[PDB]
Amino acid sequence: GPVKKWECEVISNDNKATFIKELKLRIPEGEVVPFRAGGYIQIECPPHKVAYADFDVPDEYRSDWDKFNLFRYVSEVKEPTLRAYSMANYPEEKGIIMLNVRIATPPPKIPDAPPGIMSSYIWSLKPGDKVTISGPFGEFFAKETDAEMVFIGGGAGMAPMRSHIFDQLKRLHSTRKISFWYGARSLREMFYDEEFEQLARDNPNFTFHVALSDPLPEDNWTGHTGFIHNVLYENYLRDHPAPEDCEFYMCGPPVMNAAVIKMLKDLGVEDENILLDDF
Ligand SMILES: Cc1cc2nc3c(=O)[nH]c(=O)nc-3n(C[C@H](O)[C@H](O)[C@H](O)COP(=O)(O)OP(=O)(O)OC[C@H]3O[C@@H](n4cnc5c(N)ncnc54)[C@H](O)[C@@H]3O)c2cc1C
Numbered sequence: 681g682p683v684k685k686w687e688c689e690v691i692s693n694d695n696k697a698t699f700i701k702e703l704k705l706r707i708p709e710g711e712v713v714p715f716r717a718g719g720y721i722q723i724e725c726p727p728h729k730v731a732y733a734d735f736d737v738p739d740e741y742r743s744d745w746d747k748f749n750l751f752r753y754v755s756e757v758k759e760p761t762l763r764a765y766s767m768a769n770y771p772e773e774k775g776i777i778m779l780n781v782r783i784a785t786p787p788p789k790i791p792d793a794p795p796g797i798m799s800s801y802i803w804s805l806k807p808g809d810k811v812t813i814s815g816p817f818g819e820f821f822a823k824e825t826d827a828e829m830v831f832i833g834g835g836a837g838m839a840p841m842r843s844h845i846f847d848q849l850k851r852l853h854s855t856r857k858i859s860f861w862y863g864a865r866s867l868r869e870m871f872y873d874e875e876f877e878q879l880a881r882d883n884p885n886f887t888f889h890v891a892l893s894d895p896l897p898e899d900n901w902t903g904h905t906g907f908i909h910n911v912l913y914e915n916y917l918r919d920h921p922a923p924e925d926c927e928f929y930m931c932g933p934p935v936m937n938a939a940v941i942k943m944l945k946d947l948g949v950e951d952e953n954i955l956l957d958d959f
């Protein structure tokens with residue numbers, strides 16, 4: 681049973697943070713990609729050569745791209761390849777597949793390594809380009825219980841976080857207690873926050889919190905600071921009567937995943953109540 685494919689057209693490919701783009705694809709009209717929240721597709725690329733200098737990076741992120749000389753990078757692949765990306769839209773957002781794609785630059789200590797293949801290709805895409813996706817696939821799925829849900833996200837982990845949370849509130853009309861905790865470095869790295877604030881106004885059982893590890897003075901930030909595992913503990917789990925009765929859904933960078941899961945285990949949360957997507 682061959683995997684299904686769709687040739688989609690790029691609607692938009694906008695930065696949402698210094699190093700994350702929202703790639704929004706139009707599904708062919710009259711077609712459906714029958715995915716579940718937390719699920720993903722694979723993208724393919726043809727052979728290509730792309731220059732970071734040709735990327736469309738909005739001006740508020742350019743001084744950091746210039747600082748790290750990122751516009752000098754070039755990426756070339758001579759054979760097609762495939763990679764997985766998680767849906768940021770939820771299943772009732774029809775007609776589109778929306779992705780959050782981190783640019784996978786070379787390691788700081790090995791700066792002359794090749795850039796990441798598929799993320800560099802994706803950042804080269806412009807409105808009207810065509811891309812082939814396949815699947816959908818999934819395993820990062822919500823448990824269907826009445827337990828309280830705690831979503832913890834970082835970086836491009838925002839995509840399955842958004843999909844799950846909108847799926848619970850808008851498709852399932854869930855009455856469960858749900859909260860979302862997102863760690864980012866500074867205010868310009870935060871996105872979709874207006875959507876989550878509106879969901880929290882409309883859904884008394886839902887709350888949303890951002891921690892900034894290194895806010896800039898000009899962020900004028902009076903919110904939580906530091907790492908999200910500490911903020912989640914200090915502002916919520918420390919006087920929760922039974923954190924072990926919560927379901928925790930984690931998708932962030934590895935240093936986040938490790939710190940959150942360690943903090944949860946220290947509280948006595950069982951592995952079966954911790955679901956991780958480690959990209
Ligand atoms: C189920 C699943 C879902 C995912 N969902 C998402 C998502 O929603 N968003 C997202 O951004 N990603 C997601 N990922 C990750 C994604 O699939 C890719 O792994 C990611 O985009 C990086 O792939 P790439 O082709 O750009 O880089 P690759 O070509 O795989 O390279 C990876 C890294 O290795 C470095 N490298 C290469 N050669 C060398 C070398 N010689 N020395 C040192 N370093 C080297 C590259 O510079 C790059 O940093 C998901 C992964 C899975 C499995």
Ligand SMILES: CC(=O)Nc1c(F)cccc1F
Pocket residue numbers: 834835863864865893906907908909932933935936939
């Ligand atoms: C440990 C940790 O959470 N670090 C971190 C950060 F400080 C900013 C953004 C993402 C992160 F994972």
